[PDB]
Amino acid sequence: SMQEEDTFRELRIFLRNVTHRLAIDKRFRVFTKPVEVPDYVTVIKQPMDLSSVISKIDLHKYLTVKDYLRDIDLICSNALEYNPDRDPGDRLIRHRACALRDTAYAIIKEELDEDFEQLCEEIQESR
């Protein structure tokens, strides 16, 4: 229905705004573009980055905030797995990756209405 389509459009508008606020943050520049380094493709089976997230929003791939946060969590978990060493370069990326994840979750906790996320879930489960 039109009411359901309007609901998913509001979700996309919200997700674009959150992703924009993450992508303009200087700490998260490393996560804004797809991966220069030839061993990434063999360590990371599903690359994810904020530009790819924006593309998925516009392709209507996220019907719930949980769908979106799964890809934020993938950005973070990929970074922790590809950068596990004690070296300062690894530790810096791990710190930024957890900050990206924590920032996304915090924006959603403070700004997304629980009843709006619940409606999205109940429409998606009906399909």
Ligand X SMILES: CC(=O)c1nc(NC(=O)[C@@H](C)N)sc1-c1cncc(N)c1
Residues that bind ligand X (CB under 6 A): 1, 3-4, 19-20, 23-24, 26, 29-30, 32, 35, 50-51, 54, 79, 82-83, 89-90, 93
Structure tokens at 37: 């380094």
55 SS3 class = helix
Given the complex with ligand X, which of 93 and 112 has the nearer CB atom?
Answer: 93
Quote the least distance from Cβ 5 to ligand X, whole Å: 9
Given the complex with ligand X, which of 37 and 109 has the nearer CB atom?
Answer: 37
* 31, 51 contact by CB (below 8 A): no
Q: What are phi and psi of 91, to 5 degrees?
A: -65, -35
Quote the least distance from Cβ 33 to ligand X, whole Å: 7
Cα–Cα dist 78/21, whole Å? 21
Quote the least distance from Cβ 112 to ligand X, whole Å: 18
Structure tokens at 50: 């904020």
Pick from 25, 23, 18: which is nearest to 62 by CA? 18
Given the complex with ligand X, which of 68 and 82 has the nearer CB atom?
Answer: 82
Quote the least distance from Cβ 117 to ligand X, whole Å: 15
